PDB file of C-alpha atoms (C1' of nucleotides) and ligand atoms in Angstrom:
ATOM      1  CA  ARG A1291      -1.851   8.291   2.786  1.00  0.00           C
ATOM      2  CA  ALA A1292      -1.850  12.120   2.670  1.00  0.00           C
ATOM      3  CA  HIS A1293      -4.917  12.372   5.015  1.00  0.00           C
ATOM      4  CA  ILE A1294      -3.177  10.221   7.689  1.00  0.00           C
ATOM      5  CA  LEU A1295       0.000  12.377   7.398  1.00  0.00           C
ATOM      6  CA  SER A1296      -2.019  15.684   7.527  1.00  0.00           C
ATOM      7  CA  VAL A1297      -4.891  14.993  10.020  1.00  0.00           C
ATOM      8  CA  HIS A1298      -3.544  12.404  12.536  1.00  0.00           C
ATOM      9  CA  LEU A1299       0.243  11.811  12.280  1.00  0.00           C
ATOM     10  CA  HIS A1300       1.333  15.497  12.653  1.00  0.00           C
ATOM     11  CA  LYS A1301       5.009  14.634  11.791  1.00  0.00           C
ATOM     12  CA  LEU A1302       5.752  18.031  10.130  1.00  0.00           C
ATOM     13  CA  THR A1303       5.060  20.004  13.415  1.00  0.00           C
ATOM     14  CA  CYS A1304       7.648  21.327  15.898  1.00  0.00           C
ATOM     15  CA  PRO A1305       7.862  19.322  19.193  1.00  0.00           C
ATOM     16  CA  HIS A1306       8.138  22.706  21.080  1.00  0.00           C
ATOM     17  CA  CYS A1307       6.824  25.895  19.344  1.00  0.00           C
ATOM     18  CA  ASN A1308       4.100  23.995  17.404  1.00  0.00           C
ATOM     19  CA  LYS A1309       4.915  25.716  14.074  1.00  0.00           C
ATOM     20  CA  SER A1310       5.070  23.333  11.050  1.00  0.00           C
ATOM     21  CA  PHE A1311       7.386  22.942   8.023  1.00  0.00           C
ATOM     22  CA  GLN A1312       6.853  21.820   4.391  1.00  0.00           C
ATOM     23  CA  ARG A1313       9.612  19.096   4.574  1.00  0.00           C
ATOM     24  CA  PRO A1314      11.274  17.050   7.414  1.00  0.00           C
ATOM     25  CA  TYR A1315      14.616  18.648   6.415  1.00  0.00           C
ATOM     26  CA  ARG A1316      13.523  22.163   7.502  1.00  0.00           C
ATOM     27  CA  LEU A1317      11.976  20.736  10.715  1.00  0.00           C
ATOM     28  CA  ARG A1318      15.392  19.190  11.511  1.00  0.00           C
ATOM     29  CA  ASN A1319      17.199  22.497  10.896  1.00  0.00           C
ATOM     30  CA  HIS A1320      14.564  24.350  13.034  1.00  0.00           C
ATOM     31  CA  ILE A1321      15.029  21.945  15.997  1.00  0.00           C
ATOM     32  CA  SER A1322      18.836  22.324  15.630  1.00  0.00           C
ATOM     33  CA  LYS A1323      18.554  26.136  16.371  1.00  0.00           C
ATOM     34  CA  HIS A1324      15.243  27.507  17.765  1.00  0.00           C
ATOM     35  CA  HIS A1325      15.026  24.594  20.296  1.00  0.00           C
ATOM     36  CA  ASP A1326      18.763  23.667  20.456  1.00  0.00           C
ATOM     37  CA  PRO A1327      20.737  22.000  23.311  1.00  0.00           C
ATOM     38  CA  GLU A1328      23.830  23.783  24.778  1.00  0.00           C
ATOM     39  CA  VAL A1329      26.025  21.825  22.210  1.00  0.00           C
ATOM     40  CA  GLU A1330      28.783  23.703  20.326  1.00  0.00           C
ATOM     41  CA  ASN A1331      28.166  21.851  16.987  1.00  0.00           C
ATOM     42  CA  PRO A1332      24.379  21.797  16.296  1.00  0.00           C
ATOM     43  CA  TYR A1333      24.755  20.158  12.816  1.00  0.00           C
ATOM     44  CA  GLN A1334      25.630  16.466  12.180  1.00  0.00           C
ATOM     45  CA  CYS A1335      26.279  14.710   8.844  1.00  0.00           C
ATOM     46  CA  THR A1336      23.005  13.048   7.743  1.00  0.00           C
ATOM     47  CA  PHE A1337      24.597  10.326   5.541  1.00  0.00           C
ATOM     48  CA  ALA A1338      25.610   6.632   5.802  1.00  0.00           C
ATOM     49  CA  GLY A1339      28.629   5.966   8.081  1.00  0.00           C
ATOM     50  CA  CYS A1340      29.834   9.640   8.338  1.00  0.00           C
ATOM     51  CA  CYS A1341      30.459  10.800  11.952  1.00  0.00           C
ATOM     52  CA  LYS A1342      31.374  14.520  11.436  1.00  0.00           C
ATOM     53  CA  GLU A1343      29.683  17.523  13.047  1.00  0.00           C
ATOM     54  CA  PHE A1344      29.669  21.271  12.340  1.00  0.00           C
ATOM     55  CA  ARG A1345      29.057  24.731  13.877  1.00  0.00           C
ATOM     56  CA  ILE A1346      27.105  26.453  11.036  1.00  0.00           C
ATOM     57  CA  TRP A1347      24.606  24.985   8.495  1.00  0.00           C
ATOM     58  CA  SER A1348      26.739  26.320   5.593  1.00  0.00           C
ATOM     59  CA  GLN A1349      29.663  24.071   6.649  1.00  0.00           C
ATOM     60  CA  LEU A1350      27.324  21.028   6.604  1.00  0.00           C
ATOM     61  CA  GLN A1351      26.025  22.054   3.144  1.00  0.00           C
ATOM     62  CA  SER A1352      29.670  22.281   2.026  1.00  0.00           C
ATOM     63  CA  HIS A1353      30.540  18.881   3.599  1.00  0.00           C
ATOM     64  CA  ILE A1354      27.568  17.117   1.914  1.00  0.00           C
ATOM     65  CA  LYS A1355      28.377  18.743  -1.496  1.00  0.00           C
ATOM     66  CA  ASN A1356      32.132  17.923  -1.141  1.00  0.00           C
ATOM     67  CA  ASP A1357      32.301  14.412   0.418  1.00  0.00           C
ATOM     68  CA  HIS A1358      28.813  12.984  -0.328  1.00  0.00           C
ATOM     69  CA  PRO A1359      28.019  14.206  -3.928  1.00  0.00           C
ATOM     70  CA  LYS A1360      25.380  11.959  -5.545  1.00  0.00           C
ATOM     71  CA  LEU A1361      27.062  10.447  -8.649  1.00  0.00           C
ATOM     72  CA  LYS A1362      25.991   8.026 -11.441  1.00  0.00           C
ATOM     73  CA  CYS A1363      28.311   5.155 -12.520  1.00  0.00           C
ATOM     74  CA  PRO A1364      30.128   6.278 -15.715  1.00  0.00           C
ATOM     75  CA  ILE A1365      29.414   2.853 -17.313  1.00  0.00           C
ATOM     76  CA  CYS A1366      26.007   1.686 -15.959  1.00  0.00           C
ATOM     77  CA  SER A1367      24.500   5.029 -14.680  1.00  0.00           C
ATOM     78  CA  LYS A1368      23.281   3.448 -11.381  1.00  0.00           C
ATOM     79  CA  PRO A1369      23.484   6.117  -8.609  1.00  0.00           C
ATOM     80  CA  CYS A1370      26.049   6.097  -5.749  1.00  0.00           C
ATOM     81  CA  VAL A1371      27.223   8.442  -2.937  1.00  0.00           C
ATOM     82  CA  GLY A1372      30.722   9.977  -2.861  1.00  0.00           C
ATOM     83  CA  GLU A1373      34.223   8.872  -3.956  1.00  0.00           C
ATOM     84  CA  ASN A1374      34.113   5.602  -1.974  1.00  0.00           C
ATOM     85  CA  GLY A1375      30.716   4.773  -3.550  1.00  0.00           C
ATOM     86  CA  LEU A1376      32.093   5.136  -7.087  1.00  0.00           C
ATOM     87  CA  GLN A1377      35.353   3.286  -6.308  1.00  0.00           C
ATOM     88  CA  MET A1378      33.408   0.378  -4.650  1.00  0.00           C
ATOM     89  CA  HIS A1379      31.002   0.117  -7.603  1.00  0.00           C
ATOM     90  CA  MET A1380      33.839   0.250 -10.182  1.00  0.00           C
ATOM     91  CA  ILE A1381      35.019  -3.203  -8.958  1.00  0.00           C
ATOM     92  CA  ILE A1382      31.925  -4.775 -10.596  1.00  0.00           C
ATOM     93  CA  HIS A1383      33.002  -3.785 -14.119  1.00  0.00           C
ATOM     94  CA  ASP A1384      36.720  -4.588 -13.506  1.00  0.00           C
ATOM     95  CA  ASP A1385      37.843  -7.362 -15.913  1.00  0.00           C
ATOM     96  CA  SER A1386      41.003  -8.151 -13.884  1.00  0.00           C
ATOM     97  CA  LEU A1387      39.146  -9.193 -10.668  1.00  0.00           C
ATOM     98  CA  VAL A1388      35.703 -10.115 -12.047  1.00  0.00           C
ATOM     99  CA  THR A1389      36.636 -12.760 -14.663  1.00  0.00           C
ATOM    100  CA  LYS A1390      33.160 -12.391 -16.221  1.00  0.00           C
ATOM    101  CA  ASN A1391      31.405 -14.354 -18.950  1.00  0.00           C
ATOM    102  CA  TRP A1392      31.129 -13.057 -22.495  1.00  0.00           C
ATOM    103  CA  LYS A1393      27.736 -12.758 -24.321  1.00  0.00           C
ATOM    104  CA  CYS A1394      25.881 -10.879 -27.110  1.00  0.00           C
ATOM    105  CA  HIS A1395      23.426  -8.122 -26.032  1.00  0.00           C
ATOM    106  CA  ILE A1396      20.724  -9.722 -28.295  1.00  0.00           C
ATOM    107  CA  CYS A1397      21.822 -13.154 -29.688  1.00  0.00           C
ATOM    108  CA  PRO A1398      21.041 -15.907 -27.042  1.00  0.00           C
ATOM    109  CA  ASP A1399      23.706 -18.458 -28.128  1.00  0.00           C
ATOM    110  CA  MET A1400      27.113 -16.736 -27.537  1.00  0.00           C
ATOM    111  CA  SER A1401      29.811 -18.209 -25.213  1.00  0.00           C
ATOM    112  CA  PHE A1402      33.234 -16.568 -25.780  1.00  0.00           C
ATOM    113  CA  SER A1403      36.430 -17.303 -23.755  1.00  0.00           C
ATOM    114  CA  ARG A1404      38.302 -13.926 -24.200  1.00  0.00           C
ATOM    115  CA  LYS A1405      37.447 -10.192 -24.576  1.00  0.00           C
ATOM    116  CA  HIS A1406      39.156  -9.743 -27.996  1.00  0.00           C
ATOM    117  CA  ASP A1407      37.213 -12.770 -29.300  1.00  0.00           C
ATOM    118  CA  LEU A1408      33.848 -11.348 -28.089  1.00  0.00           C
ATOM    119  CA  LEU A1409      34.434  -8.231 -30.248  1.00  0.00           C
ATOM    120  CA  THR A1410      34.240 -10.528 -33.359  1.00  0.00           C
ATOM    121  CA  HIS A1411      30.462 -10.999 -32.879  1.00  0.00           C
ATOM    122  CA  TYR A1412      29.829  -7.288 -32.176  1.00  0.00           C
ATOM    123  CA  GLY A1413      32.167  -6.590 -35.175  1.00  0.00           C
ATOM    124  CA  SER A1414      30.105  -8.746 -37.632  1.00  0.00           C
ATOM    125  CA  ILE A1415      26.516  -9.507 -36.476  1.00  0.00           C
ATOM    126  CA  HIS A1416      26.400  -5.971 -35.088  1.00  0.00           C
ATOM    127  CA  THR A1417      29.055  -3.250 -35.732  1.00  0.00           C
ATOM    128  CA  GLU A1418      31.043  -0.619 -33.679  1.00  0.00           C
ATOM    129  CA  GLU A1419      27.627   1.077 -33.044  1.00  0.00           C
ATOM    130  CA  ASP A1420      25.383  -0.383 -30.231  1.00  0.00           C
ATOM    131  CA  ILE A1421      28.112  -2.468 -28.553  1.00  0.00           C
ATOM    132  CA  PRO A1422      27.619  -2.215 -24.704  1.00  0.00           C
ATOM    133  CA  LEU A1423      29.775   0.372 -22.878  1.00  0.00           C
ATOM    134  CA  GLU A1424      31.375  -2.085 -20.349  1.00  0.00           C
ATOM    135  CA  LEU A1425      32.851  -4.043 -23.328  1.00  0.00           C
ATOM    136  CA  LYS A1426      33.972  -0.813 -25.114  1.00  0.00           C
ATOM    137  CA  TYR A1427      35.400   1.039 -22.058  1.00  0.00           C
ATOM    138  CA  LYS A1428      39.213   0.361 -22.131  1.00  0.00           C
ATOM    139  CA  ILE A1429      39.358   3.367 -19.710  1.00  0.00           C
ATOM    140  CA  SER A1430      42.173   2.196 -17.337  1.00  0.00           C
TER     141      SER A1430
ATOM    142  C1'  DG B1198      63.648  -2.988  28.859  1.00  0.00           C
ATOM    143  C1'  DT B1199      66.643   0.494  30.501  1.00  0.00           C
ATOM    144  C1'  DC B1200      70.528   3.506  31.255  1.00  0.00           C
ATOM    145  C1'  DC B1201      73.146   8.227  30.727  1.00  0.00           C
ATOM    146  C1'  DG B1202      72.567  13.227  30.215  1.00  0.00           C
ATOM    147  C1'  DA B1203      72.192  16.356  26.169  1.00  0.00           C
ATOM    148  C1'  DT B1204      68.848  19.430  25.155  1.00  0.00           C
ATOM    149  C1'  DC B1205      63.573  22.201  22.792  1.00  0.00           C
ATOM    150  C1'  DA B1206      61.137  24.573  25.191  1.00  0.00           C
ATOM    151  C1'  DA B1207      58.306  23.900  30.173  1.00  0.00           C
ATOM    152  C1'  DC B1208      57.429  27.160  33.383  1.00  0.00           C
ATOM    153  C1'  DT B1209      59.772  30.775  35.353  1.00  0.00           C
ATOM    154  C1'  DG B1210      61.797  36.803  36.517  1.00  0.00           C
ATOM    155  C1'  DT B1211      59.414  41.895  33.454  1.00  0.00           C
ATOM    156  C1'  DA B1212      58.543  45.241  28.779  1.00  0.00           C
ATOM    157  C1'  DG B1213      55.205  46.757  25.138  1.00  0.00           C
ATOM    158  C1'  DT B1214      50.630  45.024  21.357  1.00  0.00           C
ATOM    159  C1'  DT B1215      45.457  43.524  20.935  1.00  0.00           C
ATOM    160  C1'  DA B1216      39.786  44.364  21.283  1.00  0.00           C
ATOM    161  C1'  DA B1217      35.031  46.807  22.593  1.00  0.00           C
ATOM    162  C1'  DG B1218      31.955  50.457  21.219  1.00  0.00           C
ATOM    163  C1'  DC B1219      31.190  55.194  20.625  1.00  0.00           C
ATOM    164  C1'  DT B1220      27.633  59.534  16.307  1.00  0.00           C
ATOM    165  C1'  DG B1221      26.373  57.555  11.940  1.00  0.00           C
ATOM    166  C1'  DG B1222      23.785  56.100   7.888  1.00  0.00           C
ATOM    167  C1'  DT B1223      24.856  51.738   5.321  1.00  0.00           C
ATOM    168  C1'  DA B1224      25.960  46.915   2.742  1.00  0.00           C
ATOM    169  C1'  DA B1225      27.657  43.129   4.645  1.00  0.00           C
ATOM    170  C1'  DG B1226      26.731  37.804   6.917  1.00  0.00           C
ATOM    171  C1'  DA B1227      23.375  34.375   8.226  1.00  0.00           C
ATOM    172  C1'  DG B1228      18.656  33.593   7.121  1.00  0.00           C
ATOM    173  C1'  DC B1229      13.319  32.352   6.462  1.00  0.00           C
ATOM    174  C1'  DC B1230       9.069  30.432   4.073  1.00  0.00           C
ATOM    175  C1'  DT B1231       6.326  29.699  -0.208  1.00  0.00           C
ATOM    176  C1'  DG B1232       7.082  27.980  -4.154  1.00  0.00           C
ATOM    177  C1'  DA B1233       8.737  24.820  -8.044  1.00  0.00           C
ATOM    178  C1'  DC B1234      11.214  19.842 -10.000  1.00  0.00           C
ATOM    179  C1'  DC B1235      12.786  15.774 -10.206  1.00  0.00           C
ATOM    180  C1'  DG B1236      13.891  11.124  -7.697  1.00  0.00           C
ATOM    181  C1'  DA B1237      12.244   7.804  -5.001  1.00  0.00           C
ATOM    182  C1'  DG B1238       8.412   5.435  -1.928  1.00  0.00           C
ATOM    183  C1'  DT B1239       3.997   3.529  -0.576  1.00  0.00           C
ATOM    184  C1'  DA B1240       1.384   0.056  -2.155  1.00  0.00           C
ATOM    185  C1'  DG B1241      -2.738  -1.391  -4.565  1.00  0.00           C
ATOM    186  C1'  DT B1242      -3.239  -2.543  -9.155  1.00  0.00           C
ATOM    187  C1'  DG B1243      -3.620  -5.187 -14.064  1.00  0.00           C
ATOM    188  C1'  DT B1244      -3.777  -9.038 -16.856  1.00  0.00           C
ATOM    189  C1'  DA B1245      -2.975 -14.023 -16.953  1.00  0.00           C
ATOM    190  C1'  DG B1246      -2.823 -18.907 -15.345  1.00  0.00           C
ATOM    191  C1'  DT B1247      -3.414 -23.265 -11.968  1.00  0.00           C
ATOM    192  C1'  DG B1248      -6.151 -25.432  -9.310  1.00  0.00           C
ATOM    193  C1'  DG B1249     -10.677 -26.871  -6.958  1.00  0.00           C
ATOM    194  C1'  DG B1250     -15.087 -27.515  -5.916  1.00  0.00           C
ATOM    195  C1'  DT B1251     -20.330 -27.150  -7.323  1.00  0.00           C
ATOM    196  C1'  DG B1252     -23.650 -28.529 -10.234  1.00  0.00           C
ATOM    197  C1'  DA B1253     -26.134 -31.332 -13.867  1.00  0.00           C
ATOM    198  C1'  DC B1254     -26.871 -35.423 -16.067  1.00  0.00           C
ATOM    199  C1'  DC B1255     -26.156 -40.089 -16.671  1.00  0.00           C
ATOM    200  C1'  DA B1256     -26.223 -45.512 -15.882  1.00  0.00           C
ATOM    201  C1'  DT B1257     -25.327 -48.772 -13.114  1.00  0.00           C
ATOM    202  C1'  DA B1258     -26.427 -51.590  -9.370  1.00  0.00           C
ATOM    203  C1'  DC B1259     -29.911 -54.141  -6.401  1.00  0.00           C
ATOM    204  C1'  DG B1260     -34.634 -55.184  -4.920  1.00  0.00           C
ATOM    205  C1'  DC B1261     -39.735 -55.136  -5.172  1.00  0.00           C
ATOM    206  C1'  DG B1262     -43.154 -55.309  -7.895  1.00  0.00           C
ATOM    207  C1'  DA B1263     -45.622 -55.831 -12.549  1.00  0.00           C
ATOM    208  C1'  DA B1264     -46.894 -58.500 -16.551  1.00  0.00           C
ATOM    209  C1'  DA B1265     -45.073 -62.358 -19.756  1.00  0.00           C
ATOM    210  C1'  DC B1266     -44.964 -67.278 -21.091  1.00  0.00           C
ATOM    211  C1'  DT B1267     -44.773 -72.114 -20.517  1.00  0.00           C
ATOM    212  C1'  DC B1268     -46.703 -76.359 -19.119  1.00  0.00           C
ATOM    213  C1'  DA B1269     -50.025 -78.857 -16.864  1.00  0.00           C
ATOM    214  C1'  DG B1270     -54.575 -78.457 -13.917  1.00  0.00           C
ATOM    215  C1'  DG B1271     -59.786 -78.864 -14.513  1.00  0.00           C
ATOM    216  C1'  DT B1272     -64.358 -78.951 -16.486  1.00  0.00           C
ATOM    217  C1'  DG B1273     -68.485 -81.570 -18.744  1.00  0.00           C
ATOM    218  C1'  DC B1274     -70.278 -84.055 -22.082  1.00  0.00           C
ATOM    219  C1'  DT B1275     -71.144 -88.748 -24.210  1.00  0.00           C
ATOM    220  C1'  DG B1276     -69.296 -93.100 -27.016  1.00  0.00           C
ATOM    221  C1'  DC B1277     -69.147 -97.034 -25.529  1.00  0.00           C
ATOM    222  C1'  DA B1278     -69.479-100.734 -22.276  1.00  0.00           C
ATOM    223  C1'  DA B1279     -71.396-103.443 -17.838  1.00  0.00           C
ATOM    224  C1'  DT B1280     -74.034-103.627 -13.425  1.00  0.00           C
ATOM    225  C1'  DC B1281     -78.445-104.363 -11.891  1.00  0.00           C
ATOM    226  C1'  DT B1282     -82.810-105.484 -13.360  1.00  0.00           C
TER     227       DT B1282
HETATM  228 ZN1   ZN C1101       9.402  24.868  17.066  1.00  0.00          ZN
HETATM  229 ZN1   ZN C1102      29.455  13.174   6.073  1.00  0.00          ZN
HETATM  230 ZN1   ZN C1103      28.622   0.804 -13.379  1.00  0.00          ZN
HETATM  231 ZN1   ZN C1104      24.491 -11.216 -31.092  1.00  0.00          ZN
END
DNA sequence: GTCCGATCAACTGTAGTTAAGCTGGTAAGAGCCTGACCGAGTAGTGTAGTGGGTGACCATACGCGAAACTCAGGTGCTGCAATCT
């Protein structure tokens, strides 16, 4: 895989000056300046569904760090991008919309009908230690 | 939808606030490439299980031949009798 990407598919080289760069990111920045079109805003947001464009690389660095920070779900630690990403993923845990089933983390048999009732099993066969966070998190 | 016409400022007459860069010695933006660090990507891998087809060995079958066994053919004398003498 490395041989193909270093002897035949020269993807890390400039299309114009024939320098090369240690990551595609720096090649992109290089093309955006040293071989740039007459465009006023040489930088464009690299992320999903974002259409914004910028004059100086520092403003793009700021925009990525502000509006596309890479987060982990507070409950399930799965990664997501930006405020919308977190708010979209938080629906999955929501007990008002997602009228989910109720089970033990270990015991195969459980089949509760309400959240308060599920805490009886975790309060007796387990205890207040090693209950799952989605059950515990009365955060709203 | 349109009608009147009041009315913030559109577009119209002159009176007074903004850089650029010179002498310098200088630290300030905006920056570059090698390097390091973790997350994720490319993708062949590591046990583990379902199926199939090959191979060996058997026995079952007929069909031709091989020897078996049963029952009746065949040899040869002579005890007894009859033809020729
Ligand atoms: Zn180049
Ligand atoms: Zn963006
Ligand atoms: Zn979550
Ligand atoms: Zn249990």
